[model samples]
Target: GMTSQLNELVEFLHSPQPAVRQIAIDNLVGFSAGPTSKVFKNDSYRPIKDIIKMIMDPEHGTRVIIQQGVTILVNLSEDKLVRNIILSDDKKFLKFLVWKIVDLTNPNADIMCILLSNLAKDDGILAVLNIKRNSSGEEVDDGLKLAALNKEVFKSLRAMDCLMDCFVKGYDKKLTKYASFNYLAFFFADISRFKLGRMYFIEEQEYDGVVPISKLLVFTEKYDAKVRREGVASTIKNSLFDSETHERLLKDEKINLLPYILLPIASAKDSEIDEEDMFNLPDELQLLPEDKERDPIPAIICCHLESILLLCTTHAGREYLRDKSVYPLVRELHKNVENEDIGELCYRIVNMLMRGEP
Candidate 1:
């Protein structure tokens, strides 16, 4: 009886109608999930392996149908033993699932990003670290360590590259601030595996390492409020702040240098100022340009001021700022703090100045 049901499902795999084939695959998966599901779920079951084999069938419809079958199997099977059997044997199943997710009629980037993020987390770093052998049997570090270590899993992840490309195109088309921000967040989170110190400077001594940061900044400048907010947050949190790290950031001509300046400004505290007048100064003491119709001088000026504050906060930064004659501009900022909409900008700058002292 079971043989007859399976035989019928097998026959439907060659159905001319895609819908019919899909239904057949769904039915098989449903059967596998039923009380008598173990017949197909058993690890020793040859037919289970055959079902997986059919996923790679030459016909496109057959392959798609088989992929759907695997997806269903993955969803229905709660048993880890059964799930592991399917996952280990048919790695392509996971890849195909990721692709189908992108191709869905209504794909949500947040949900998709969450799915991918969780997948990456569950898979762990070992999935991306590859072992290389040299001519003398010595180990050579393969550059794919962070994103592509396990050949099977990496192949699956690599297959999703097209999906990611599609997502990026959709993101650019919408150009919403939230979407842009989400895209940048996903990108940074994806690349976070590559430690900043090693990937950007220690191991790779090239200017190209700054490319990702530059791209993120450009995205932040786009219309997305969330993108700008999170971008700034992540930048500050992830900044390499040690002496050598600061030196590298300052010396590098490629970096915009504005963010580096704003960090200390944005992070200023009121307790640092010793002078009673400056200490009790209203938080809104600083003024910035306010006319929305006018050129964005306030925002630009804020960026410049933040850069100055950051520079003056550290010995290395202060030395650079002094050499560049930035102190004059600093004093001007302090003097105009009462009239301009400097927002928290003045406080940040003053905090940096105080930090330089102790």
Candidate 2:
């Protein structure tokens, strides 16, 4: 059954007959769901790249097929690669599709959130940063200026208003469980743009203060299961560690969100324990103890915690981590003997600071 469908779809994609191709494209769009459903769950099935290539095809028919195919694929697939491809590619097809796919006007919050998440990825942010840096210099070529302006269209308050409306409207509609995360991700992407001074709003300085605070609140309070936890952790870590945004977020009132950062740090300790228990796991996972906890935290959490603490101290961010319940955890973690690179790094920083070392 699977091979028969694959052969038919492949033939339709390669066929010279336009009518047959259109029919085939429609079929593939429908069927893409079954095969690609779990594509993002693993490292395989990098469909987004293939979809990107198809959308960029020079032929109108081919591009149309691919464009429609992308809409279907995104609706079906949960793959991060789909997000990654859209964010990394600066091609016209993707730029065009971002509006069609992500706007609240479309009323599909789940896919819209996924698109926002990918667009907020480190690579995506870097691509935007690269554009900003290259376009602002003395050269000021018209072509580059035009391209920058196009990208700038997505950075306006009007765009953010559309996004927030989608979030609120979709929240009322219950389009997706994590519709809020999508809004928060868009907020962060905008924050990243503003931090680079690429986004300018009507009130100027008022927009600057309003945007980050709003983003931080949404990010911290996001009801999306993971965004409330891991997503916020990731954004906070980046904002704190990023040289450009670090000092700025430190003095902001949203510094109240600092305590949640410890959640992941606490989580990482449990992850290291499970990692060491790999040899003890049963061959059939079903036979294993269900009571056993698997911590999703990684070594990166320690580095993130240290970075947050350092930034907080430097900028006088509320001192939330200085609470009696929290400091001892940092101290005990330092006193432990594991000494992995990240562990050692976290320990050295905290130990030196405790001893009054500058």
Candidate 3:
């Protein structure tokens, strides 16, 4: 039954009529989620190219079909075959998807964001986003011939440029309804797990004048969803693992990553901290009101603390933390943290700072 059903759907997906294609995609959404999803794992009955074409369909009257096609792709991306097909055509499928994500004019742009998020969940695909092209404009095709490359996806697609821009601004009142764009944070977190990804955020300044991580830092202390909060916190934590960048990250004129990492765990909600200690806190933390809340999730709080711990990995980093008066806020957090796991991490960070580098 499923075999025949899939055959018909595939045929309909290629139908000349947009309305029939819409019906086919709408039904395929259900199939992608159902027991028949295995069929999508192979190219046999899957019409990926047609689906991509529909997603980029420019006709004004077919917006609903385009949006529905995006939804089905999100569901279908779980299969490697689907991801590979989309990636195989960097110019046609991948670029158009990234373009729609930053294109505020496209109502379905938000779903496009989610679709890319789904694809990046794959480690191989994640590498595609991380690997960069050479300065001479040669492609990094060797590594991913076994898998995929960075330049093909990152530079040629200008993927990060579109992603960072849409990420920070997608939630604006004008564009908010178009897409929440929060899912991009998870994509950021996933990429951050890699050394190449860390370098991109820490070093890449392609989008206007701001570094990639700076755009992400603004969301660290505030968010509309826990996913956004968690993703951003993990991303910050991951970037901290790059101990080599400690100086630039700590400098006041550069990223100034300290206050953002500390703020989620060290708020000025209470009046208990000593005057000198309070004055020692980052300027951003010193002025908070009594009602200011630390991020409510313990895991997220732990991520912030761990990021501080990461900053202590090198002697220079440890010394930087010591000079910034980081102990005062960390001490306060350590005293108040109910989560022992988080408290243990804070204690570890304190130990690193309190002890002189050998």
Candidate 4:
């Protein structure tokens, strides 16, 4: 009976005829809160898993049509059992999603991001944690973890190669942003597993291990910190590609010397100075008190920081950063840090920063 039901739904879903697919969507997922057909609501995951292929095809499915597929499972995701099946450690479900993004069509990636974000929760999210109640019980969208650990996901998604190409070609900036957002999570999730992250981490192809080296010094031998550090966080690296950049960061003392208490730097002001007496400050800050364009800077900056920890895995990288007493700065940064991910990252950075110390 499930076989016949799934076969009929799949036929309706992929059919060129709009009416056929619409009938399936109407019954499978109510266009609104309309009563769902008992045929699927009470069934096992078999039907949901089967029609999943219908959405994965390269065909251009509309948002309305695409939602027809994931939304049902989203509802079923409320069930602990169904949730486990969807988020299972096996590759079938992840493979299905990987294909959906690989075959990225309009309205597909949008819902897919939402779909993936949703599936990130439920018991499936619990599968990978260490009972680690982060500070104040901090946690993240554990669902994105799946995107990282599984190489097959990247195999289909084409990893950074697809995204970097998209950026260079001037694709829709929003989709690129979402794609980047997803890629960054997956990449961070599995950075320990592969070399592909560095494959495109830098653009001018120069990396400082945290961010890219600014091309401002391309014509001259530049000091590390003189390479303008990006104020915004989302803008990833583009300069470091060769040993020249790494050697620069190692020997050059002028990297982005983050405040010992970076969390307070955003709002710190001198109590002695009158609030209105800012004519002496930087022009933009004097005018706006605080500039707004750099909000994206925080997360991206932390990501670069994490990348630097990754760099410390090597002897040379470790020697330079470690001798600099980066461990103290990293530990200091964690004390007043508010965001858990950033905080944990600081600990990891400090952990690596200590390797060469003791």
Candidate 5:
């Protein structure tokens, strides 16, 4: 009796205690996790639709309740059929979810990032459609090329704009902003490769907030080390395609972003490895997060440093980095790291700079 069951789940969701509300949501979530043609298909989006509304409810939308609701929807979003049903409604879809990031009347950047991350996790629904294409005569991968030109990912809804807003408006200390742009860099990564994509990201010579490059650099100096790490990679990700932007960084002594490039090269692997042995470290140094877990950012940042090396074709750029003793510092940091990707990349960067592009 789904009729009775629907009403029953809805009734419990309206329960006074948060725990009681979760039980109802969890049942549906678990149902979705298993074989439940009955869950989304037979019963319709009714159960899930109501859950969506509950997430928006002013009174009932406690984190206790919203987490499960967002979780259930994130689960639903994993399925192509279910994703279509959920995204079919604009008021309940990507646009709305982007709006909710700063829904200041009742903000929740915490869950918003997680939701966007999941929705776009696997090259995203937008990437799969292949609804549009861009060719720049470069050697970037086909899937990456597809992702860059994705009209759905960057349209009138202005998904990129919202994430940029999240960066400007959201808190720096929180992981939300860092997470948002991590996806942004990946989402429009190939954007740096083409004129069409460049219009959205690099915006080439013009230094405005439209492309988010300048703003992203500001985070590289963040007091919070993890955010700073993300800032370096994401900023480099966005503007490395353009020569003028890096040249601009060098000119502004007030904005000595040279450190942003050099320091990450010198950065040790994890947050803890940084803190444990820092007293004897240089005065200009900053500590990354102390946790020893496998963070993807460290390796990815290493990759970006590689990109910077590639970008240093300009004699002035190469001379600027050499004056900073960048290669020596990279070797100093290399000695500390053992077998991690970051350590290996340090060796590569050093090898190229010292041995001349081996």
Candidate 6:
């Protein structure tokens, strides 16, 4: 019964009547949500190609239709089969997606970015994103030429630039409609799994001369959504693995990440931190609001702790963490922390920072 229903919906997407096509996609959006979501993944009769085709076809690309399609695709993109369909399309659906999100005029840009975050979850998609391309905007296929003119595909697509802009600036300067670009945080985390992603975050400067990761640091304290906060923490943890950027990341004049990493774990009690030790902490962390609480989520707390633990790997990271009065914050965090893993990491970090003769 459901098979026949979806089959007809697929047919309706191409109907001559605009209302019919709109109605079909509206229904498809329903089918893609909650318990019915599995229907798109489990049932043999999926309208995935039909849905993606509608997005690609110029005739069906009405504002309402594309917005609905963006929502449907974002939902369906969660399934492996759906992602494969999007990736395998010779019609360049992936390229279309990359181009569309950066089209400042496109109203549905936020959902497109979310869809990208979902697709980046797949390792296959990650490799595709990490592909080397030539200066001519063509994908590099020859092995020998690969080392010469090959630039990262991400740079060619202008995705890193667009995403950094959206992440930091939102949709518009006028602030008429606010697009959160929140899911981009997770997208950053997923892409950062590869070396190029980490490099872009650390080294690449946007048009305004700000490092990509510099803008992302403030979101570590975003109280609105747990997902946003956690994604930022994860991305920060991922960035810490890049040893080459340690000095830049730690330097006060550069993208000083230490304050953001330490703020979530710092103590609210003024008495807990001594005067000289508190003075050595980043100015952002030294002044305490009495109500300030350490990061509540255990997993996110570990993200911050692991970031510190990873920092211990490099000499520059070690010296900065030591000289920055990091031990005092960890000491305060360790005092009442309940999670065993957090406690253990805290112990490891305290030992790591304190044990070396400074």
Q: Quick one: best TM-score, which candidate? A: 3
- The whole-model C-alpha lDDT of candidate 1 against the native structure comes to 0.42
Error of 2 at 177 (Å): 10
* Order of the predicted models by TM-score, top scorer first: 3, 6, 5, 2, 4, 1
For 274-356, candidate 6 gives per-residue lDDT tens digits of: 79897898889867788887778889989999998888877778888888888878877888787899999989997777655
Residue-wise lDDT of candidate 4 within 1-358, one digit each (tens)? 7546644664455466666766776676752223343344334555555445445433544556566777776565545565566667343455445334433333445445445545544534322221221222112223222222223222222323332232222223344343432332332223212224333333333212333222221211111211113211212222222444465544543333222112222233221233444333323233334421212234544755654565566667677655444454455445645677768788787777666433
**Over the stretch 129-154, how does candidate 2's per-residue lDDT look in tens digits?**
22222331122232221222233223
TM-score of 6: 0.80
Point out the higher-scoring one by TM-score: 2 or 6.
Answer: 6
Of 1 and 3, the candidate ahead on TM-score is: 3
TM-score to true structure, per model? 0.41, 0.49, 0.82, 0.41, 0.55, 0.80
lDDT of 3: 0.70
Off by over 4 Å in 5: 1-26, 30-67, 78-92, 121-162, 172-201, 204-211, 218-235, 238-257, 267-304, 313-317, 354-358
lDDT of 3 by residue, 248-268 (tens): 788846566788888887666
RMSD of each: 12.3, 12.5, 6.3, 13.7, 11.4, 6.4
**Can you give the lDDT of residue 37 in candidate 1?**
62
Q: Write the per-residue lDDT of candidate 1 for residues 59-139, one digit (tens) a residue.
A: 543534544555545443455554455546655544433433333232333443333433432323222222112222112
The model with the greater TM-score, 2 or 5, is 5
Q: Which pairs of residues collide in model 3? A: 131-150, 144-147, 144-148
* Model 2 poorest 10 in a row by lDDT: 136-145
* lDDT (tens digit, per residue) of candidate 5 on 261-351: 5545454453233333454433344454443223245564575666556546555666566555565556655665564777777666665
Q: Which candidate, 1 or 2, has the higher TM-score?
A: 2
Error of 1 at 59 (Å): 5.7
**Model 6 per-residue lDDT at 162:** 52
User: How much is the lDDT of residue 235 in candidate 3?
Assistant: 89
Please list the residue runs of candidate 4 whose C-alpha ends up more than 4 Å from where it truly belongs after superposition: 1-21, 30-45, 56-63, 73-105, 114-160, 166-315, 322-328, 331-335, 338-358
